[PDB]
């Protein structure tokens, strides 16, 4: 519950800022921006292609994306690279949904991403020290 | 799809035989019996206690059990010990549901177990050679 709310907060705020323009949580958002933005840049062409293959017709259509994320981890491997890649693809998708409909919300998207992440990887996240661990892994000097 | 149907078959048949009395698939069932029965025996007291904590009021009530299984793997670790333990606990639960209602079916239970297993661990199962890998891991001489 604690980890859910904290994750929802961070992911939601990132997707909101991405769809528009706006402790660890501050650090986590600052890290999510740097890494997530880079992911989206390096892989823009690929991301657009994937967006073409999937559907997502509106704000509420997330079931498609959920299956994609669940399939990402189905090989039994977990790491921060994968978690942040999926969030960044979520941000990319949030941008797309806002373009087609300027008064759609990211809130359902962010909850679906959070849901998968937290429900499927709760103990791993806890062992990795949650968002503090996220910040430390991507830390640069 | 192939792995889903094959897994559904094996898990369903095991739970059916457990709730009542009746290639790799034959070997897998033969292995599932030996290991699954032993799990249930060694841990009968513990299994009964867990059954007390959960609810499962009938055949269709599986959402509770699904969350338990998903939480088992949330630490990011996968192995056959866990997969077969969950199936055995599923068999134990199938026995319980049949006792309270002699004309209830295991079919929804087996599908929920299969669903979690296959959807969340598809690539891992494939890399472990599916049910052939299951048979080999528990092989005794």
């Amino acid at each position: 519950d604690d980890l859910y709310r904290q994750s929802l907060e961070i992911i939601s705020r990132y997707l909101r800022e991405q769809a528009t323009g706006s402790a660890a949580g501050r650090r986590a958002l600052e890290t999510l921006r740097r890494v997530g933005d880079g992911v989206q840049r390096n892989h823009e062409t690929a991301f657009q292609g994937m967006l073409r293959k999937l559907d997502i017709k509106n704000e509420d259509d997330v079931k498609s994306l959920s299956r994609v994320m669940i399939h990402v981890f189905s090989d039994g491997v977990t790491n921060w690279g994968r978690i942040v890649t999926l969030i960044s693809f979520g941000a990319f998708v949030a941008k797309h949904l806002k373009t087609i409909n300027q008064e759609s919300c990211i809130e359902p998207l962010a909850e679906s991403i959070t849901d998968v992440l937290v429900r499927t990887k709760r103990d791993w996240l806890v062992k990795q020290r949650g968002w503090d661990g996220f910040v430390e892994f991507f830390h640069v000097e | 799809d192939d792995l889903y149907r094959q897994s559904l078959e094996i898990i369903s048949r095991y739970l059916r035989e457990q709730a009542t009395g009746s290639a790799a698939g034959r070997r897998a069932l033969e292995t599932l019996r030996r290991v699954g029965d032993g799990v249930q025996r060694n841990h009968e007291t513990a299994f009964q206690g867990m059954l007390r904590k959960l609810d499962i009021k009938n055949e269709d009530d599986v959402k509770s059990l699904s969350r338990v299984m998903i939480h088992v793997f949330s630490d990011g670790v996968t192995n056959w010990g866990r997969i077969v333990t969950l199936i055995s606990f599923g068999a134990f639960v199938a026995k319980h549901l049949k006792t309270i209602n002699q004309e209830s079916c295991i079919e929804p239970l087996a599908e929920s177990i299969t669903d979690v297993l296959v959807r969340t661990k598809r690539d891992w199962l494939v890399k472990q050679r599916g049910w052939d890998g299951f048979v080999e891991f528990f092989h005794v001489e």
Partner: peptide
């Protein structure tokens, strides 16, 4: 769907090994 999943998993694992 599953199989854009596997090819997010090229880009993530090979981000994971950048860090």
């Amino acid at each position: 769907a599953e199989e854009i999943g596997a090819x997010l998993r090229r880009m993530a694992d090979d981000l994971n090994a950048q860090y």
